[PDB]
Design an enzyme around this catalytic site. Structure first.
Site, PDB file in Angstrom:
ATOM      1  N   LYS A  97      31.533  14.201  35.233  1.00  0.00           N
ATOM      2  CA  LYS A  97      30.510  13.227  34.881  1.00  0.00           C
ATOM      3  C   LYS A  97      29.234  13.909  34.434  1.00  0.00           C
ATOM      4  O   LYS A  97      28.520  13.406  33.565  1.00  0.00           O
ATOM      5  CB  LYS A  97      30.192  12.308  36.037  1.00  0.00           C
ATOM      6  CG  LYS A  97      29.592  11.026  35.566  1.00  0.00           C
ATOM      7  CD  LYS A  97      28.717  10.404  36.613  1.00  0.00           C
ATOM      8  CE  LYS A  97      28.695   8.887  36.444  1.00  0.00           C
ATOM      9  NZ  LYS A  97      27.867   8.235  37.488  1.00  0.00           N
ATOM     10  N   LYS A 353      25.019   5.075  37.239  1.00  0.00           N
ATOM     11  CA  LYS A 353      26.390   4.719  37.585  1.00  0.00           C
ATOM     12  C   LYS A 353      27.158   4.100  36.414  1.00  0.00           C
ATOM     13  O   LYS A 353      28.341   4.382  36.234  1.00  0.00           O
ATOM     14  CB  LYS A 353      26.434   3.839  38.843  1.00  0.00           C
TER      15      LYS A 353
END
Lengths: 465, 105, 105, 468, 79
Positions: A97, A353
């Site tokens: 990520k 997120k």
């Protein structure tokens, strides 16, 4: 029947260990019997507690003088650890990520080493940087590190365990990484633990690369490496109040002497409603934490670090219902002695997120200042504006394509777009803005548009030539 | 003749610079724009021109403040529907079709 | 103000329990809702709002009896269009959009 | 006790200020009217669970028909009076004048039929039954004009006027435009029209109070035979046809036993919570048909005493540019609680087929029913006993619309459901069978083509048909 | 009040000190013992009597509240 149908499942891992990588063999059984020593703990398993107006101090009272004087020289006693185990497939990206374009286009990783580079190169210091990566993200971070040599930052990686997936119906293993509570066992086992205490350090500062506010704060550090009167500190926990935003998680309450992390998953059917307000628990887990190295070595030699077996279920996709045994990082303030965290402005907790948080962060709402970003004035009021971008906006490469420029926001308060909606350059969203395209239809907002408190709906198409 | 495509000086108006190419811009407007009092109401501020080559509007359309048009701009809204163009919009060499109404707060 | 977001205590009214977070949650209702007469045409059965955060309605929208609105709720019907919410339906953070005609007998 | 004696006599002095503006001769019955209000109002100021009705007091009709037929002569009919309740305009159907004059078949009007019946009796029985209509200021001059056409016909025909009360104010509690106080105003206004004393002195003893909606309400020899020459002795007095409940007529009226005698109970006087037990759970299979057989003798006795006890039905109503207005009315059936020896008899739904909407009309003018000299009855070859269910949308509501949407009323022997919504047209000789749903969205039309056989189908679309 | 044209209705809420004296009910209230007048609006549904404000009862008080994104313009009290 309690350990009798466990002894038959300990014989199954012997049918797997036999298939070792000849050399890669001593690190597998290290895990497997950490997993067994957890499986044992799995089958077994107050209220009196009132958290004190003593331990959980306000950020404002520590920020008030304040800054350390010498030299410092207090920084050479801290190690920055960041958790880099998360894949970014919910944003729709292959691999790690921390490899996602966050701004200009500094990735998630870059924005920390940039923070650290700024630190060493303004204080003559050398603060190291440790990434904790799983077996999904280690392959791919190592490659992407060659580009930080000749950056004034010492970078080290290490691997979380690799535990087997256990069936909810079968209870028979055929691979997953044990949350982030694995920090302690695999940090000690790497050899890095003994290295840092060994070069003069004593404090770790664990945070997530998801959290962009998660900066190296000095006024907190001054409270540790050379504290205000009293013993301590063995383990601090940054803690925020509650927004309606995140309703659930669990809070830090004082359970018979020491302070505990208390989960929703842990609590009896009778008190699931008692947690989460009436807000006698205005307390929330940042997952920002400092730690005594010297203490971790003492307590992971005793194994005195017992943590709650967070059990995840999930069948996805075409398999069958399976359980993962996991542990959390905060799940261990009950095991460190004299242990006391602090309340922190949300200022210091902006986790990224979804693709909606990207838009928020990578707009003129935040100013970037060598790695760290903060809410640049002028911006009338301190409130963080709400963003709900569509399902047509999830996959990053889509999100990027929909925005031919990331538009003006400094005076927007709420935005929600859904449907095939697509923006121009130099757009200005002020106030509340609702743009909705219904299944099929399409709204492309033209370049330079200034939507102030407005409801855009219907189908408008714009072609070229 | 009331754009910034001409400037006004003591009674006469003539096609000021910078208008880099001698071209007179060709402008068709729809039947919905014919009554002057309608025409005024639909343009909430006369739009920017200067770079204008062709402009053709038919259908119920509306412009906001500070619309900037340049190149060829075709805006068509079919019978029944309306196209609202957002304050500040800058159109270069586009066809706009379809229909949105923008509504307040 | 006439929702269960307040409690009637001696004539004067006050935000009730247990509205977790003491923040007045703003709402925003369509052109076709401004007239007090049409405001009671559309509702009569003032909805549940103890857990509302943001409500925004526009177009021809009418409501059933005992509707629960919870969180962000957006209801948009375009021009020529109507949406009728079924009685007792619970809307928690949802975007409702299109055409719902709930005719009778 | 203090303010209430004052805010009653405020209205006393208030309706005195109205009277003084009365036409010279409209004084008589208009003085008597507002005195009836004074009564209703003074009753309005003042204001169980012991309810549960015995198996001997509501009789199944089938028992009675099997007794059965009065043998002589009979000519037991010259003891009977048929009151039809006429008051009630047909605006709800979308029409001028009195509902009682809407085209129902062939085309006879609603009245056209109940005289058509009361005629077929007298004719085949060499008797003379009277038909008495009870209409109000809304329905009066407009029906009296049309009576011209029932001469040469074998039915003596009578009308009288229901009273006419002032709409009180919701806030104000003050008068104001006027209204008829519901059918319950039959006792006071019958007595006072004089026809009551007129009839008693002609040897009649029973009224058969029904509706001109109710095509089902027909004079029945068997219920008669139980009222004149009534078994064992007794000798009542009030008899109220009653039917079984369908979900259709859920929220209606039911008899119970309150403190000795029967009693009516409308959903209105029901305690907030107990509404759920009332009318479902059933438990109360009994529902009010409003077909009533009543003794003249007894009305005389009870009215001259002020004994006929009816609960007050309170009506908010505010239409059109008008303010919010209470309108006090009384029920017929609520009288039962005051009569003597009362009994309800339970009747085929067959006898209760009220026509209140245009959907109803469709049904009743189909090939489904048969018109047999004034009365109509559902007919073989319709084999499954049930009545079909029909919803016609807001596009069919006004009678004129309805008639023009159907080039020919369609074939319907074998229909179970029919629901149509919005702009629809039917050609000639349509045939509907089973469950036919025809639904067209706002601003679309469906022309169903002539000759069409829609057997058990959902039909959606937008299709118009055209010509030469 | 009279409406004059800009080429060649009430007096707002401000006109109250001048028309409180107008009815004369001004000299009516003070003669019975009353010392204070709580003026609010009829729109404001929070406009209740506060017995914690009467305990601080000066010659003139104005209730005030911080600005919010919601109310763009308005009056601001400075010294």
């Amino acid at each position: 029947i309690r350990q009798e149908l466990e002894l038959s499942v300990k014989k199954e891992l012997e049918k797997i260990l036999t298939t070792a990588s000849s050399h890669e063999f001593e690190h597998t059984k290290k895990d497997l019997d950490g997993f067994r020593k957890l499986f044992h703990r799995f089958l077994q398993e107050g209220k009196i507690q009132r958290p004190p107006e003593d331990s959980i101090q306000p950020y404002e009272k520590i920020k008030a003088r304040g800054l350390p004087d010498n030299i410092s020289s207090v920084l050479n006693k801290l190690v920055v650890v960041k958790l880099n185990g998360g894949l970014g497939t919910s944003m729709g990206c292959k691999g790690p990520k921390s490899l996602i374009g966050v701004r200009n286009e500094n990735t998630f990783l870059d924005l920390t080493v940039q923070q650290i580079e700024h630190l060493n190169k303004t204080y003559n210091t050398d603060v190291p940087l440790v990434l904790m990566n799983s077996f999904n993200t280690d392959e791919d971070t190592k490659k992407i590190l060659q580009k930080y040599n000749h950056c004034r930052v010492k970078i080290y990686t290490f691997n979380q365990s690799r535990y087997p997936r256990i069936n909810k119906e079968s209870l028979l293993p055929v691979w997953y990484p044990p949350g982030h509570g694995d920090i302690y066992a695999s940090f000690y086992n790497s050899g890095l633990l003994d290295t840092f205490i060994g070069e003069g350090k004593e404090y770790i500062f664990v945070s997530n690369i998801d959290n962009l506010g998660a900066t190296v704060d000095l006024y907190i550090l001054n409270h540790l490496m050379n504290p205000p009167n009293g013993k301590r500190c063995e383990f601090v926990m940054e803690v925020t109040n509650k927004t309606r935003a995140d309703v659930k998680g669990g809070t830090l309450t004082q359970y018979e002497g020491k302070l505990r992390l208390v989960e929703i998953a842990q609590v009896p059917k009778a008190h699931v409603d008692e947690f989460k307000s009436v807000s006698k628990f205005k307390i929330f887990n940042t997952n920002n934490l400092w730690i005594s190295l010297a203490a971790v070595k003492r307590l992971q030699e005793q194994n005195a670090i017992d943590m709650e077996i967070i059990v995840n279920a999930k069948t996805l996709d075409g398999g069958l219902n399976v359980i993962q045994l996991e542990t959390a990082v905060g799940a261990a303030i009950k095991s460190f002695e004299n242990s006391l965290g602090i309340n922190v402005p949300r200022s210091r907790f902006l986790p990224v997120k979804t693709t909606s948080d990207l838009l928020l962060v990578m707009s003129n709402l935040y100013s970037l200042n060598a790695g760290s970003l903060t809410m640049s004035e002028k911006r009338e009021f301190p409130t963080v504006p709400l963003v709900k971008l569509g399902s047509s906006f999830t996959k990053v490469q889509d999100y990027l394509r929909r925005f031919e420029s990331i538009p003006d926001m400094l005076e927007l308060d709420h935005l929600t777009v859904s449907g095939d909606v697509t923006f121009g350059k130099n757009v200005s969203l002020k106030g509340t803005v609702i743009i909705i395209a219904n299944h099929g239809d399409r709204i492309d907002i033209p370049p330079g548009a200034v939507l102030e408190n407005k409801i855009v709906s219907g189908n408008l198409r714009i072609l070229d030539h």
